[PDB]
Amino acid sequence: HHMPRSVTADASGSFLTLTFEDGSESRFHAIWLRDNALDPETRSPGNGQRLITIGDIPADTRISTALVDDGALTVTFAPEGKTVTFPGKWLKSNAYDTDQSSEVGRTSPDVETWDSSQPAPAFDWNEVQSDPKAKRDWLDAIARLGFAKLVNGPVREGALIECASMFGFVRETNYGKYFEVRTEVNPTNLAYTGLGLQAHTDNPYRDPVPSLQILYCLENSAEGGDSIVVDGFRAAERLRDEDPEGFALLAGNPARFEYKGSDGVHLRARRPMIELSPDGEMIAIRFNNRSSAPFVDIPFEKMEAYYAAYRRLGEFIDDPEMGVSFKLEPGESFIVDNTRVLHARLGYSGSGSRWLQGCYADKDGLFSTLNVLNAQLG
Template sequence: MLSGLRRCLSASTSRRALWSLKSLGTPPFVSAPRFGHQTLATAPLPAVGGGGTSLAVRRARALAHERLLQVEWEDGSSSLYPFTWLRDNCQCPLCTLQSARARSLLLSDLDVHTGVDHVQLTENNKVSITWPDQHSSEYEPDWLKRRCFSPEARRARQEELFLNERTFWDSGLRIPTASFEEVLHDDKAALAWLQALRRVGIVYLKGAPVEQGQVAKLSKRIGYLRLTFYGHTWQVQDKPMANNVAYTSGKLSLHTDYPALHHPPGVQFLHCLQQACEGGESEVVDGFHMAEQLRREDPEAFSILSSLRVDFTDTGADYCDFCVQSKNRIIDVDSEGKVVRINYNNATRDSVLDLPVHKVQPFYTSLKSFVELMNRPENVVTYRMEPGDLVTFDNWRLLHGRRSYVSHPDYLRHLEGAYLDWDEVMSRLRILRKAVHGDAP
């Protein structure tokens, strides 16, 4: 089946454009080819509880002056836990609703300056603490180890929870590809799909039925679709009196969808039902990679685009009538300066520009630099979708576009699209990872 898919792909896309998830083994992408200065490789997930990774506690003692519990592990390492945090996270039935794994203890009842009366190890190697009010708490070694406060442990835990590491790419990318039916029905295939979607930002699914409703069916593998003003799903076709530039046959420049919303959809599905006879090739670029490249090549432009908030607008009628307005930075960064989202759509960038007049020209100069960087041939991946192809991609990261095409009334190019949010996608990824690997929460 895979060899058949590769033959189809070579007929419709660049020979290096797509590659199979199934051929990679575990972990995904280890055997991927190099291109530029990047390698399609994903770091293995941090070790988690179970499967022989448990560590026994050698000793636990209270450091009263520092108000910390010190836990020494059998491998010689140690961890420190603040008293207040331990009391706040008591796992007993009075303090935690076990069925929901939710805290019952009210913050108003928490003594944030609490000490401890007594610390000991139980016969089954749990850490037991008696508090000044004689309340008792017990903590499993694995539970404590996974919540160690060391910088290394915190980084590993955050990576395990959110898969924050990304694999950057340029025009040499061979888009990860998988079987639509396998993703629908096999947990391992679905997990590999979502991990690749998170790491690389784009995954191609082959073999979807050539009929509407497949993006909705795929969404049920995750949870549910994101409803927008264009509906739960939407039909990308050349339409008279189009209410969106995507519903024309003209070229679509590289963009992210819906920056006119303050919280744009995180993930996009596009399913090809019919392709144009001529033209209509899709283009994608790694926005995170481009932002980092801009940071290196033009730090001032990066600073401007990651600090100034730009107006976006979208007005019309579809699922219902709408008049959307937002203010977003072209490049969103977190508190540590890491790029977390790209917000750029030239079609919906508003003529209203809420900037001091002296910042207008620097803004345009910076944005032009970013767009020219994205459009360099060495950064753009081009592929052609054929009926039955379904592409899934990270709308916070990738900028996508489309070449113009010849519109014919008897052979109308038709894609069906849908959105999801990253919260739902990451939720399903964690559930699948536990089902496949037995990872502890």
């Protein structure tokens, strides 16, 4: 329950214990409550910005008195003398006196991992623009699963930029706001089109890594070459469940990535292939064979085992039962969460031409747009 019943303050005033109507208890420290006061002199009413620093809060701050009344908690602090009230709902929702999961390599509860049994989420270009429920569902699919298709879009150059603008902002690079991906498939070219088709995340040599990628089809007359996506979190999960020490090595040591092109682009980054939050949640995958650079940061005594784990992760990524495959017809596109979901394509099986456009955008904007839609539809 989120309905407060009563409160006791410790003799020290250093914390209080809130009891709810279902019998549950939750303890809150004086300093935390003071810092999180929601009144107009702590949080600006117009923009929600906090108006005080930690330095502004007296170091000896304590709870003087407190009371539960009519679904809310009244708290008065000393030595300031400041009285504030907290809604019951807010206290329960923002509780920290709970059992924090510490499992190393766990995923956020908001994501669902997948393999080849997962259908490609698909949404309509026009519906996502006119119906906020469709837009919400489209962005929610990218949030939960890390990818989604958009179909029935226009066969127009730069349309992918319009897609990005539906939720956020394009990460412009040296290659432009977007780049052309043109392919001529014929008997002569067929050989080299088979090279470098391992699933990968783009640009692990950029820090910060571009967090979303959009690929948009304008023309396709070549047979085969289905797009493939692989869940980096599923691959990492499989490694962890099988080989926790190997998982720990890939998460516990940075790799090196580098792109040094002939057209004056030289990009480098130092980041692990599996990135965890400091409390163990899996937050990002970086995997790209073509731009992996010399691993200079891994101690000698761990290098062999690191390489073994790296190989094993690659085997999960190369596993065909991990890939979700789909065709892209003119006007169709897909987005990947480039911090999680890898992409590639299968081999071409017939001659022809293909024209895709690619760009990057950032997840923060997508989540904001999703948050706003959820509030509007709630």
